[PDB]
Structure formats: structure tokens, C-alpha cells
UniProtKB/Swiss-Prot annotation, chains A, B, C, D, E, F, G, H, I, J, K, L, M, N:
Self-associates; enforced oligomerization induces apoptosis, NF-kappa-B regulation and interleukin-1 beta secretion. Homooligomers can form disk-like particles of approximately 12 nm diameter and approximately 1 nm height. Next to isoform 1, also isoform 2 and isoform 3 may be involved in oligomerization leading to functional regulation. Component of several inflammasomes containing one pattern recognition receptor/sensor, such as NLRP1, NLRP2, NLRP3, NLRP6, NLRC4, AIM2, MEFV or NOD2, and probably NLRC4, NLRP12 or IFI16. One of its GO terms (molecular function) is myosin I binding. GO terms for cellular component: AIM2 inflammasome complex; azurophil granule lumen; canonical inflammasome complex; cytoplasm; cytosol; endoplasmic reticulum; extracellular region; Golgi membrane. The CARD domain mediates interaction with CASP1 and NLRC4. The chain holds residues 1 to 91 of 195 of the full protein. This is Apoptosis-associated speck-like protein containing a CARD.
Length: 91, 91, 91, 91, 91, 91, 91, 91, 91, 91, 91, 91, 91, 91
């Protein structure tokens, strides 16, 4: 399958346990493109990094999942991680 | 068949594992109108969200099931899920 | 031949395997009208849904069989199936 | 047919699966008045609530079955279910 | 013809498929008064409730057949069917 | 014979034990085309993926079965399995 | 001779024993045209697929037997069975 | 059902996790009036507020449960929470 | 007729299904006196408690059957049932 | 008679009960060569490994039966049993 | 039946889950007087309090079971529980 | 009959359910002497300790069965049960 | 049978539970050579180490199974385990 | 059974939660005598004191288990615990 399920993991494994919670919280209110669902709170507020990567690639696709992860990471301040994620996904 | 069973599921999936137990506990003593039975403790304290919503639409009807869920949600404090459920059910 | 043998089936085939046992158990102690017999334990505690519907329409007639099934279902709390059966049989 | 088989069920469905095992274990050593047999251990440790109620009303009569169930429930601590059982059976 | 052949039937149709085997097994060693033979083990372990009632009223008379059935039923614990049999036969 | 009975399995076998339960639950309320029946609740809430795909292709036709599976899958959010299901069935 | 008895056998042989019993049950109450008899309960609830096919082609004619079988199959939900049955019998 | 099961919960959620342990420890030696049992240590030393209030209303009744909770709360020092509990319970 | 066919039953109904299989397995290799045969594997590993008691009293005798059952029970650990069987058989 | 009926059995006994169902399910939709019939669904979904082996060698010949079994095994993923079957049958 | 199976439970429900593991571990190497077997490690390291007390009264007798439990409890340091057990058992 | 069927059982009942699975898995690849068959994977991965001992003594003889069990036990690291089996079988 | 099913186990049993999930997640997107299937997501995200080794040697062969496990272990960082697996497999 | 499974516990129960990790880590590289296996990292880094003592006495024997524990304790600096372990085990 696509390798985008790995580039996301390498991006979410570099987050500390404190800013992973911030990522999950901001995932609850980020604007979404039409036709895509939103992860429910009950599952979102308890997943670890691996489950979160699986769920992100499941609800969204490779391209949109990577793009959404990059946008959320950039909006919360982390610039180098979003940059390396975009570098890994685009080429 | 009515879509009110999906609305309850969308509201019970936004509760974490902690206030789901609180919801189930509050369901054991909430006042009920006449002609409706009460879910026994033996099964109530073990269902997850899916079993709970199915069982709620089983004992109570769609309209009363949604109304009772909204009442219990307001009673325990959550005004956002209750408002979402009212919006989904009424119209 | 009356169609009431079908409306009962649609009510008993929507019960889970656990609550079918509850239905059969409650059928052993429900009050009965005069002139109607009671299903013996040896056969009742082993029937599946289809045999149960056949025996219910055999001992009790169409109207009384449907009414008794609705009463037992409503007594054990299941009001959606009871209402469905009442709507199907009354008209 | 007496309704005491129902009142027992409402008492055995209102207690969790963890303490149903405790009830069945207490049932192996509770003193019995003369002329009444004891449920064999091979089947007593595998029955769920429904078969337990049926077996209790079969081995012991309605009055003594309800009395024994109330006594066992009181002995193991639960006096809410025991209280409602006594209220239902006596009147 | 005496009605005692019917009452025994009403006692053996309330026994499940597992208690009927226990009844037939106990019938091979129950003490018997003088002048009455014992059912051979070849046919006893293969007949159903109806054949069992017929042959019980055949070997033993109506009064002794009912009394023996009640005694065996009390021996294995089931004192509800035994009580019903006594009530039906004595008066 | 149509090969899309194999595609549906590939979509139902990629779901975890928790979201398969949600799929079965949402299959109880999805709108249906005229002339197509609804799977009874008693058997639907107990079958696994293999029985589910067999009965999905049995009750509804081949193309409609695939399309309904895709509709339900997108409704609950999973648009990765739904997309590959469309890719398999359409061409 | 007509080959409709082959098409009916093909339709009844591809459905499991569980819904075969349901088919035989609904054959007891399906509406019939005037001049056609009803299969008695004593034989209907015991015959297998082969005997059922033979007696369906016996009591009713080839055309009416096939059409009634298709009607019963659609009524009980299986729309794949009836489709191939009508395809075979019509041409 | 009485609302005092909800009054107790409101008392056990407004006290911190450090003093919930103190409450549970004090519950192990508080004097009890005759006829009432004592919660075993193994279960008591592990429940959270929801399980604790459920089991408090289970072992003791509505009135005695509320009274015992108020007694323990005053004993350990918290007078505001006990006063709130009396205000909720008595009227 | 000897009552040892009953006491043995009381020993084989007071042990669970996981101990009955162990009893049957150990009955395969227990030492036997001369002149007594061994139950074949094909039938022994399939019969339940009742058939086991009957065939135990058939192959062996009353006294030897009871003694062998007690020896197997004590070898597999259960001392309470073995002592009960001793008390029942010796006097 | 060829021994190829054994090589199939050695392939159907080394796969678990969960994936025997998947094998039987894919046996209902695998493409078939001209002149060969399809096993009826009613009997397919109930046969065990031995009955399945006999049926496979009956409907299809030894060569085509082995080839079809290998193809179905490779399609469903298991390429360890498929290679073993191919090695056993080809030489 | 003796009440010793009741006292042991009162001693095993009053100790935490952390030290129940210690009790079960100590039970694997405690010296045993002759004529009594040792509980196998496979089942001993998985039972809860109820199964443990049933197994203890099964392998050992009432007197020896209580004495051995008290000895093990004193061995690991818990003196008050052992004193309670001795007081309940001896008189 | 030899006692080696018991010494194996005492070795397979003294190891937990987690490492029983490891034992069964290692039994699929252990080298075998000439002329001895290998247990098929379908039945091996589902049987418990009792069935495992029975089939171990069936496929392999007493001497080789005990030797193979000890070899597998030392292979998977358990030097205690293996030594106990050595002592039990040799003398 | 090849010993490679044991080399893989020693590699998968020597890594913690937190990184076993990472291994199973990386197994969902690793490139595969042509002709080999992919483990379905539903079963892959639930099996433990033993089932994982069994199915790894099932879908892939001895050589390719070991090679794929080594490649995945190398990719996710663990160089010691991959080196040990390569040393065990190659010679 | 030997008492050395107790002394080890008394040596591992006196370890703080921090130095227990150091003990388990040094257990991964301590040299072992030939014929003894090494505990895998998967379980070694998750067991607490009780499972660790059981595992040590299982993989190694009484004498070697005690000796290895003493050597590891001396290596990591803790001398008084090693001394008391020697005093307990040797005499």
C-alpha cells in the first residue's frame, strides 16, 4: 500500500506526551473538507500514536491524511516536523 | 426505519470512558413516564456505546429514547452533546 | 388462513438469543384466559423462534396469540417490538 | 400459575455478573430446611440468571424459593434487592 | 378408565430432556414393593415421555404408579412437579 | 457467478472487532430501496464477517449489496475501505 | 415433461437448513389462488428439500408452483434465490 | 426510584482523589447499626466514585446510605459537603 | 437392587464439566483388577455423567464400581467428593 | 484408485476452523471450468473437512479438484498449504 | 453442609488483588500433610477469590482447608485476617 | 495400561494458558523420528491440556510421547516441569 | 518442517508490547513481492506474538517469512533483533 | 515442594520499584550455565516481583535459581539481601 501511513508515524512519534494531547485536542475542531467525517471524542481522546496514525489513514486518505496532519502540526506551532512530513510525502 | 438510532450513537460516542459510566449510572434512577420499564443493573453496567444505544431504542421508542438521552445528558452537565442531540432529533 | 402467524415471527425473529430465553421463561408464568392451555416446560425450554411461533398459534388462536405475545413482550420491557406487533396485527 | 417465578428474576437480573457467581457459591452452603434437596454443584456453577430462577422455583416451591433467595441476598450484603424481593413476594 | 395415566403425563412433559434421563436412570434402582416387576434396562433407556407413562401405568397400577413417580421426583429434588402430581392424583 | 462477493469480504475483513459491531448496528437503520427486505435483528447482531457478507449478497443483489456496503462504510467515516470497495466492484 | 421441478430443486437446495424451516413455515400461511389446496402440517414440517420439491410440483402446477416458490422466497427476504428461479422458469 | 442515589454522587465527585481514599478508609471502621453488612476490603479499596456510590446505595438503603455518607463526611472533617448532602436528602 | 448406582451419580454431578473430562481421561489408565474389562475410548470420551454412572455400574460391580470411582476421585485431587462417596457406600 | 483424495485432506486438516469457513465461502464464487457444476450452498456451509474432501473429489476429478483447491488456497492467502498440495499432487 | 466454605470467602474477599496473587503464589509451595494433593499451577494462577475458595474446600476438607488458609495467611504476615478466620472456624 | 498418560498430564496442567499455546506452536515444528506422524494444525491449535495429552499418547507411544514432551519443554525453557517429567517417567 | 517458525518466534517474543504494535502496524504497509497476499487489518491488529508467527509462516514461506520479518525489524530501528534473526536463519 | 521459591520472594519483595528494574535489566545479560535458557525481553520487562519469582524458579531450578539471584544481587551492589538469601537457601 501507500507509504503515507509511515511518514505520519515518523511525524507523530517525535511528539512528546504533552503535545500529542494538544494535537489530539486540535484535531477535534480543525476545518474539514466536504465528504470527510470527524473522529468521535470518546476514541480520539484515548488513542496513542499508533492508533492515531491508523485512524487518520483510515478516515482520510494518504494524501489528505498527510496534508491534514501537516496543517494541524503547523497550526500548533511545530514547523520542522511539518516540514519533514511534507518533504517525505511530496517526494 | 427512523434515523433516531443513529443520532443517539453519534451522542454516546463523544463521551469518554469515564462519563459513559456516569451516564449509565444516571440511567438507573432517572424518572420515567408510565408504561416504560427500567433497564436492569445486570446488563446496564456492562454495555458499551453500541449496545447501550441499541438497548435504549429497544426499551424506549425513538422519540422518547432521544428525549430521555437528552434529559440525562443535560442533568449530568454536558450541554453540547445534549444540544447536538436535540438538533439532530427535532429536525 | 390468517396472516397472524407471520407478524408473530417478525416479532420473535428480532429478539437476540439471550432475550428469547427470557421470553420463553416469562411464557411459563404469564396469566392465561380460561379455556387455554399452557405449553409444557419440556418442549417450551428447547424451541427456537420458528417452533415457538408455530406452537403459539397452535395453542392460542390468531388474535389471542398475537395479543399474548404483545403482552409478554411489553411486560419484559421491549416496547418497540410490542408496538410493531400491535400495529401489524390490529390493522 | 404463581408469579413468584417473575419476582425472583427481577432480583437476579439486577445484580452484576461478578456477584452472581457469589450468589451461586453461597447457594452451595446455605442451610436448608428438611425435605428439600440441594442443587448439584456440576450444574449450579454454569447456569446464568434465567436457568437459575427456573431451577430455584423448581427445586424449592414459590414461597420457600423466594424466602431462600431473599435470605441469601441478605446474607451476602445486598439488602436493596432483598428488600424489593420481599416487598414483591409478600404482597 | 382411570385418569391417573394423564396426570403422570402432565408430570413428564414438564421435565427437560436432561431431567428425563435422570428419571429413567433413577427408575432402574428405586426400591419396589413385593409383587411388582422392574422395567428392563433395554427398553427403559430408549423410550420417550409418552411410552414411559404408558409402561409406568402398565407395570404398576394407577395408584402405585403415581405414588412411585412422585417418590422418584422428590428423590431427585424436583418437588414442584411432585406436588402437582400429588394434588392431581389424591383428589 | 459474480466476483463481488469476494470484494465485500475484503472490505468486511479489514474492520476491527469494534467497528464491525458498529457496521452491523448501522445496518439496522440504513434507508433501503423498495422491494428489498431488512435483515432481522436477532441474527444480524451475532454473525461474523463471513456470515455477514454471505447474507449481504443473499438478501440484496450483487451490485446493490456492494453499493449498500459502500454507503454504510462511508456513513461511519471509513472512506479508505469504501474507496477500494468502489474500485473493486465498479471495474 | 417440464423441467420446472429441476429449477425448484435448484432453488431449494442452495439455502441452508435454517431458512428451509422458515420456508416451510411460511408455506403454511401464504395466500393461495382458488382451486388449490394447502399442504397439511403433519407432512410439511418433516419433509426435506427433495420431498418438498416433489410435493410443490405435485399440489400446484409447474408455472404456479414456481411462481409461488418465488413469491415465498421474496417474502422471506432472499432476492437472489427468486431472481435466478424466475430467470430459469420464465425462459 | 429514589433520587438519593444522585445526591450521594454529587457528594463524592466534589471531593479530591486524595481524600476519596480517606473516605474509603474511614468506611472500613465506621460503626454500623444492626442488620447491615460491611463492604469487603478487596473491593472497597479499588472502586472509584461511581462504583462506590452504587455499592453504597446497594448495601444500605436510600435513607441509611445518605445518613452514613453524611456521618463519614462529618467525621473526616468536611462540613460543607455533608451539609449539602443533608440539604439534598432531607428535602 | 443396589443403591450404589445412585451414590455414584451424586459424586459425578457435584463436579464441573472440566473435571468430568479429567475423570474420564484418568479412567483410561487407572489400574484394574483381573477379570474386569476396560471401557473403550470411543464411547468413554463422549458420554455424560448419567451414561458414565450406568456404564460404571455395568462394567464393574456395585462395590468395586464405587471403590474405583472413589480411588479415581482421590487420585485426581478431589477429597471431599471421595469422602462423601465413601460415607454413602460403606454405610 | 488414485491417492490424490488424501493430499486434499492433508491440506484441509492443517487449516483452522475459522478459515475453513472462508475456504467454503470462496468455494461458492470461484470461477469454474466448463462442464463442471457448483456445489449447492445448502450443503456447502455445513460440511466438515472430511465431507468437503469427499465432495470435492466427487464433483471435480482428482486433477481438477487438486488444482481448484490449490487455486482457492492461494487466493485466500495461505501459500504454505498451497505449495504442499501442489508438491504432493504434481509428483 | 458445613459453613467453612463461607468463612474462607470472608477471608479471601477482605484482601486486595495485589496480595491475592501473593496468596496464590504461597499456596504453590506450602508444606502439605500426606494424603492431600496440590492444586495444579495452570489453574491456580488464574482463579479469583470465589473459584479459589471453592477449589480450596474441594481439594482439602473444611477443617484442613480453614487451617491451611489460616497458616498461609499468617505466613505472609496478615495476622488480623488469620485471627478472624480462626475465630469464625473454631467456634 | 501404562501410567505415562498421567505423567504427561501433570506436566501439561502445571503450565499456564499463555505458555500452553507456545507448547502447541512448538509442537508443529519439533523434529520427529522416522515412522511417526505429525499432528495436523487444525486440531492442534484448538485442544486443551486433556485432549493434548490424549492425542500425544495416541500419535506417539508412551515412551516417545513422554520423551518428546520433555524435549519440547526444555526447548521452550521450562527446566522444572521437564525434570519432573523425567523423574516420573524413568522411575 | 522448517525451523524458521522457531527463529521468528524468538525474534517476536524478545520485543516489548509497545513495539509489537509498531511491528504489526508497519506490517500493514511494507512492500511485498508479487504473488504474496497481505494480512487483513481486522485480524492483524488483535493477534499476539504466537499467532503472528504462525500466520507469518502461513502466508509467506520459511525464507520469505524470515526475510520480511528481518526487513521490518530493521526498518523500525531494532538492529540487534534483526541481526539475530538473520544469523539464526541464514545458518 | 522446595522452600526456595519463598526465599527468593523475600529477596525480591524488599527491592524498591527502581532497583527492581535494574535487577530485571541485569538479568538480561548475566552469564548462564549451559543447558539453561534465557527469559525473553517481552515478559522480563513487564513482570512484577511475584511473576518474576515464579519465572525464575520455573526456568532455573531451586538451587540454581537461588544462586543466580544471589549473584545478580551482589553484582548490582546489594549485599545484605544477597547475604540473607544465602542464609535462607543454604540452611
Amino acid at each position: 500500500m501507500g507509504r503515507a501511513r509511515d511518514a505520519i508515524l515518523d511525524a507523530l512519534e517525535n511528539l512528546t506526551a504533552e503535545e500529542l494531547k494538544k494535537f489530539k485536542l486540535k484535531l477535534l475542531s480543525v476545518p474539514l473538507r466536504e465528504g470527510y467525517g470527524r473522529i468521535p471524542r470518546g476514541a480520539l481522546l484515548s488513542m496513542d500514536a499508533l492508533d492515531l496514525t491508523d485512524k487518520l489513514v483510515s478516515f482520510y486518505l494518504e494524501t489528505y491524511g498527510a496534508e491534514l496532519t501537516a496543517n494541524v502540526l503547523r497550526d500548533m506551532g511545530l514547523q520542522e516536523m511539518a516540514g519533514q512530513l511534507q518533504a517525505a510525502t511530496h517526494q
